[PDB]
């Protein structure tokens, strides 16, 4: 029933883009939440983190409104967060899930020591900030768990991590700032140059120029 | 409110004071509102009757210049200066001494 609307959406319908790691590599904006259901099919879980009420005064009545914060990720390397405020609570949760899907990102995973095994923890230390809220992640040895707060825990499990330490600072009872400071702490560990990214690779064309002929006809 | 803090004074401690022309209160000279005007000595609705009265064959009516000086309360009340919006507060107007006539 999904009649796609953009170029990247059309290719995913024709099975020219088979994974999600083909879009992340060239930084192509995802505009439709159906491109994520069909490339990570039925391994996408959800978690409602928070819901509260907002109020405004005008010349025609006080408007009450509901805000929701939601996170999604499969269990492997992807995770995203979104948020919306609408009249009733069911349409706010459902609209904030379409925004979380369109903000999926990848996460780099690594080992605590050595170079052998399958990755279980974060690749180095990192921190994130959002309005005086500060989160620190530290890589943990195998068979440790995820030691952190409750709402932090649901973000680090949907990303595919198994071992981690955290320390937090600042005003963390603003639960939407606490959730954004900890998504930025994973984007920081994944943004450091490691000594195996030192040697270059050959260049290639993004998928909008490889499949140029298929677009017209 | 303002980056001036309300007055045109930089890199000096004190700056001299004056007495307002309407109420007579003491104010810094850099903070007062100052206006300059050149008025004809004779009113404009009286020039015709003055051209038949003159005894000289060529007459020029005189003009004088006047500088005025008021305080913030006296200029705001008299509508010499008005309340402006946040962005329009930053617009300064000058004189350009290099104008040709």
């Amino acid at each position: 029933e999904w009649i796609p609307k953009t170029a990247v959406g059309r290719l995913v319908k024709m099975l020219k883009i088979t994974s999600l790691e083909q879009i992340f590599k060239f930084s192509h904006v995802i505009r439709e939440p159906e491109i994520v259901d069909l490339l990570c099919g039925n391994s996408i879980k959800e978690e409602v983190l928070s819901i509260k009420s907002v109020q405004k005064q005008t010349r025609a009545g006080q408007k009450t409104r509901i805000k929701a914060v939601v996170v999604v990720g499969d269990r492997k390397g992807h995770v995203g967060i979104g948020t919306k405020a609408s009249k009733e609570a069911a349409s706010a949760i459902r609209g904030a899930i379409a925004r979380a899907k369109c903000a999926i990102r990848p996460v780099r995973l690594g080992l605590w020591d050595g170079a052998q095994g399958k990755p279980h923890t974060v690749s180095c230390k990192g921190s994130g900030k959002c309005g005086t809220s500060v989160v620190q992640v530290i890589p943990a040895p195998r068979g440790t768990g995820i030691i952190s707060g409750s709402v932090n825990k649901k973000i680090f499990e949907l990303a595919g991590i198994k071992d981690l330490y955290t320390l937090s600072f600042g005003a963390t009872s603003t639960t939407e700032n606490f959730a954004k400071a900890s998504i930025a702490a994973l984007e920081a560990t994944s943004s450091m140059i490691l000594p195996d990214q030192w040697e270059e690779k050959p260049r290639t064309l993004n998928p909008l120029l490889e499949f140029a002929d298929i677009l017209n006809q | 409110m303002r980056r001036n803090h309300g007055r045109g004074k930089k890199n000096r401690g004190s700056a001299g004071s004056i007495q307002c022309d309407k109420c007579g209160s003491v104010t810094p000279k850099d903070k007062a509102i100052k206006r300059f005007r050149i008025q004809s000595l004779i009113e404009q609705a009286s020039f015709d009757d003055l051209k038949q009265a003159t005894i000289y064959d060529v007459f020029e009516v005189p003009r004088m210049g006047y500088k005025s000086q008021f305080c913030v309360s006296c200029a705001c009340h008299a509508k010499i200066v008005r309340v402006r919006s946040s962005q329009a507060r930053k617009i300064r107007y000058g004189f350009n001494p290099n104008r040709v006539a």
């Binding site: 690594g110 170079a115 690749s123 230390k125 140059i193 490691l194 000594p195 030192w198 | -």
Partner: protein, 127 residues
């Protein structure tokens, strides 16, 4: 060691702006021993210094590979058993980075000091 800390802040500034070279208007003897330990580990391309009978001059050639460098003041005294606690405080992971000490055998990083049974005064780090 006031010249060692001035040099590390000017390097962090250029490595963030994307510069290729850096010219500083000073140069000391142990500032050049610290730089020679980044060259043999692959983190800079090279350098060169001038003699002018003033405080000296030095020109560093950057690479694209440095994440950060620092200096520690004051220069604490660490026994060979306390080498490993300073490593968990200063480097992000267990596989890369180098902490440098001034021992009775020269300037060594934290892997060599353990294979020679010595301690000394801490100077800085880089990863």
């Amino acid at each position: 060691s006031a010249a060692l800390a001035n040099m590390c802040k000017a390097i962090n500034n250029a490595s963030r702006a994307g510069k290729r070279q850096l010219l500083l208007r000073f140069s000391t003897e142990e500032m050049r021993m610290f730089l020679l330990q980044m060259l043999r580990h692959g983190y800079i391309s090279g350098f060169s210094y001038i003699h002018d009978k003033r405080s000296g001059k030095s020109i560093i050639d950057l690479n694209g590979r440095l994440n950060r460098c620092g200096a520690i003041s004051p220069n604490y005294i660490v026994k060979r058993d306390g080498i490993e606690d300073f490593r968990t405080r200063l480097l992000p992971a267990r596989q890369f980075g180098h902490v440098l000490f001034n021992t009775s055998k020269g300037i060594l990083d934290h892997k060599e000091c353990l294979t020679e049974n010595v301690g000394g005064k801490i100077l800085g780090y880089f990863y």
